[PDB]
Symmetry: D2
Subunit: 96 residues, 4 copies
């Protein structure tokens, strides 16, 4: 452990995220097949754009979830500044 | 076909890109395992940030390759405006 | 008022940010003069890229400042969740 | 000069872009007044988000204009690869 407060994921949450990552995994191998089949660079870039888009989506979702629940809990419990600093670090990371 | 001029990829080009997509595929399943193991949301977000970063890298590489070779060839061959319009569309796509 | 906790800016903080916005204001009018003088589109785009860069910089700075001080204070004072929700909204805004 | 082919801007084009940069200039000074009046950091960030948004808009517009007309002309005239390389440089610049 050795980290900020966390609300554990449900069977539901894990399942949903998982599909999104599977779909994304598929897209990634789809792109793999495209490169192997020597498909047009533009077609490939379109799919890459799709992937990046799907990643921002799942990433934002996890960000909001963590802030709305886990960080919110820490604020209630008294470890908010700890959790807030973590949160700011990943924000700057997504900016770097 | 029915698309702009393309310079076909070498055994070399395909191999290199492929590793990058494999590594990225790994990262994606790594993230999958992380979610399943109910790992900390922040740790997961860091890895997602890594993935998006690796995707921008391979995407930019493919973009430059296509422009430097394929689009450049079309300009020489006389189908440059065709290839240029395609290129502008994917740029706007990466912006949307 | 009617908003989350705020630590007021110093004479110092206001001065520093101000220079950065002035410089940015200059860049913006520089770009204005460039357009008027019918300068090359590429040169103009380079300067626009500069401006956007300078804006991300000052924006991130204000973001960190607000989180490190104002939001941190609210967490101590007991209005952290209020301040956290605000913070998440502007994050999503910078993403939209 | 010493640059790729350029189609000069009309009285119209200059006028339109100009308004957009003026509005943006206003926003920038609006933000200046906000900082001076010691307004809430969140309110300021919202306006900064607005500005960055308006800059992407005018920037993309100039990008498309340059590609659709100036770079397209160079391709017809025989200096397309020259103009294409310039265009790729500013793309990478907006990515750096
Ligand atoms: Cu969390
Ligand atoms: Cu290509
Ligand atoms: Cu603040
Ligand atoms: Cu131009
Ligand atoms: Na905590
Ligand atoms: Na403290
Ligand atoms: Na072509
Ligand atoms: Na034409
Ligand atoms: Na507050
Ligand atoms: Na609460
Ligand atoms: Na030219
Ligand atoms: Na050539």
């Amino acid at each position: 452990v050795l980290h900020g407060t966390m609300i554990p994921r449900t069977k539901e949450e894990i399942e949903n995220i998982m599909k999104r990552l599977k779909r994304i995994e598929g897209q990634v191998r789809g792109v793999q097949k495209m490169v192997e089949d020597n498909r047009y660079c533009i077609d490939i870039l379109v799919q890459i754009s799709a992937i990046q888009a799907a990643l921002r989506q799942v990433g934002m979702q996890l960000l909001e979830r963590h802030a709305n629940h886990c960080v919110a809990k820490a604020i209630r419990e008294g470890s908010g500044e700890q959790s807030l600093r973590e949160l700011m670090d990943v924000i700057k990371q997504f900016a770097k």
